[PDB]
Amino acid sequence: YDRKVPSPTGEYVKEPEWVLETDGVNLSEVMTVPGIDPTRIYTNSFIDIMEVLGIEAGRAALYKEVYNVIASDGSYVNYRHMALLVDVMTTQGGLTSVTRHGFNRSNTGALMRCSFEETVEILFEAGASAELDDCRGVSENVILGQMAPIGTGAFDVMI
Amino acid sequence: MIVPVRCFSCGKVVGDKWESYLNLLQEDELDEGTALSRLGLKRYCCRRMILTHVDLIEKFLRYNP
């Protein structure tokens, strides 16, 4: 691998280093192996990085990952953007999918979930257990044809 | 469908040269190339006009009514 490194004289130089790439994962046991620098061991399997190093790390890889997907294509995307994603994917202490199994369960009002994959059902299990929708989601005010907490509807205007 | 009156491109009347052209082919036993030039059709805008035409009307006339 190629790694820039501060030289005694100050400038960054290129000190190539041997690195082992693997075709199989088991993080938990490899760090412990001697000789390797457990400080840097890595894996594209964020889940594993989660279970082993904590979630704050998982978020990291989760991004480190997404990023690579987008940059391997020469394309760039400002941090913040992906950041937000990963974070939104990482605030609930675990790895929450962008699938229905993840964010539609979220704790949100019924209507939001309505606009995504399990309407019918979502509205039943919602009626059964009398859920009260704040009506503060943009997706719901859209259903009721009212302004929403968007740029124009965050601040109120008065005389 | 009938010989275009005048060339799309430049406007040189051409519809008055179809029969002339045909004859030059059949009887004068000439090659499409010279036949054209003899009819005064010297530029290609005016040569494709006749050379490419597909006189379909002759087939539409065989339809009785």
């Binding site: 740029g151 124009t152 965050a154 601040f155 109120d156 205007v157 008065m158 005389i159 | -």
Partner: protein
């Protein structure tokens, strides 16, 4: 749940979205034959006018900034700085 004019932490500067709604709402009043608090250098379009009522801080409108808890802060178009 209100917040005194003091202890005010929100941005002194007016957000684009706030000014676009302020601009719209005044432009609309102006379009409804409402008094104009400015001198027209020869303007006719409500909005274009309303823009000039703001450029001369003469738009009697106040913005109520709700925080995420429920409280809020009332800022007046006279206070708010319009850089943008």
């Amino acid at each position: 749940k209100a917040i005194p004019k003091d202890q005010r932490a929100t941005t002194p500067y007016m957000t684009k979205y706030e000014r676009a709604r302020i601009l719209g709402t005044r432009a609309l009043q102006i379009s409804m034959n409402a008094p104009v608090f400015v001198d027209l250098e020869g303007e006719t379009d409500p909005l274009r006018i309303a823009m000039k009522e703001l450029a001369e801080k003469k738009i009697p409108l106040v913005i109520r900034r709700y925080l995420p808890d429920g409280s809020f802060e009332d800022w007046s178009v006279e206070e708010l700085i319009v850089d943008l």
